[PDB]
Amino acid sequence: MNPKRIRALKSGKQGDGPVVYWMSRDQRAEDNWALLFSRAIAKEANVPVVVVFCLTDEFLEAGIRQYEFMLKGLQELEVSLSRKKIPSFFLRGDPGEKISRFVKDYNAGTLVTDFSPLRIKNQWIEKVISGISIPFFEVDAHNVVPCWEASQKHEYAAHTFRPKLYALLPEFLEEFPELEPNSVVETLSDVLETGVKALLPERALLKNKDPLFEPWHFEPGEKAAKKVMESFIADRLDSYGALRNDPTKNMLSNLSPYLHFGQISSQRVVLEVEKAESNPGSKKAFLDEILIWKEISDNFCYYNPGYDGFESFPSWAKESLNAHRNDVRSHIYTLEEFEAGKTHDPLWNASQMELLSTGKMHGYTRMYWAKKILEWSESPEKALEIAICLNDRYELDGRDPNGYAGIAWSIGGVHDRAWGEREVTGKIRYMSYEGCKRKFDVKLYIEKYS
């Protein structure tokens, strides 16, 4: 029970005592520090622990692919907490109004939530703090090392973040204790049914009204995430290092949709991967992606209020892009062309079809996809929102600190360094279609997504 994993955001007087855990980001029962810590305070007060989830009004800003994935895993989650004598309540509405009412109605004693550096979470926390008098606590249940503990400021390079993270690995890379059960708001399927009816008009469709999304690639839920983790270690971890940059090969862990929704703990993945015997290069490469690059995204969003804006770019990148803002662009595409994949480049939209159909673009093509948006945009700011809009609308792992950090990496050179000067893009790292052809079978990738 490491105390550096928990932060106090509001102090007050404890009420009746029924610890309420406001699940937001980590939607799992196993390997949850916030759930464990909420249980960790329960016995000291001789009171039970409850779980509350909020179905916010912002779900209409996304698609059915993400709403279905979250709700189906929640359905499996509800059964899991019931086996541990933990009741879970699902509230629909603004968290500020619902959580404040629930705390007063249930006479809650202590409130616990999981950490998320996104702006919308800080928006919800602000309203809840002004509407409650019980103590408010938050726990970083998403990062191996707590975000405030890994670094106390913004890190502008991975080389400056890796030694800090690895130095704190021995203290925080530990095994999860078992979740002790308790000593002793109408339906979830109904709220799913009415939700999709509201998102039906905005469903992505093909020419013949055939829906574009294919939901058989990633089964949601805590159970399915474990099998994905087990399959990756047994079959794909050995060749991960050599084939990670090949979109034509399915050699990735495919863990981001579960990681984003908190359906599986990243710490659990690190634990099993570390024990696994594989190629040392592949293990190091995967550990770099899930430890350094994933958690530096939390660092980027936590220490930059404008993480989704041009203001958070490095100084060299802002001046370079500002100097090339007046450069004539080869082509300009609006949001409709980018969304429908109607660009002259056949590689770019081929990634878009993969994003539209499967809901998870390949890691290598996602770099090319976002950088071409900067090339074909009227301004870097326009490319920022165009990339953010498409990413947060169609990616299953979207609306995540990994997304905004990754977009900032591709467009603004965040966590990168200056490269050869070029028109339009300035000193931002360049990715050419010819360069892609020398790295992997572009034609095979294009044919698979037509």
Ligand SMILES: Cc1cc2nc3c(=O)[nH]c(=O)nc-3n(C[C@H](O)[C@H](O)[C@H](O)COP(=O)(O)OP(=O)(O)OC[C@H]3O[C@@H](n4cnc5c(N)ncnc54)[C@H](O)[C@@H]3O)c2cc1C
């Ligand atoms: C422009 C752009 C936008 C992105 N938007 C998102 C997003 O909205 N949501 C999202 O989860 N990821 C995003 N990524 C980061 C990364 O591409 C994905 O995490 C990864 O592609 C997801 O598939 P995977 O888990 O099978 O990859 P794996 O090769 O299996 O990597 C394992 C884990 O490491 C993490 N990771 C891998 N690459 C990165 C990275 N470049 N930055 C941070 N963490 C990483 C992921 O959590 C990943 O699950 C984005 C990348 C780019 C270049």
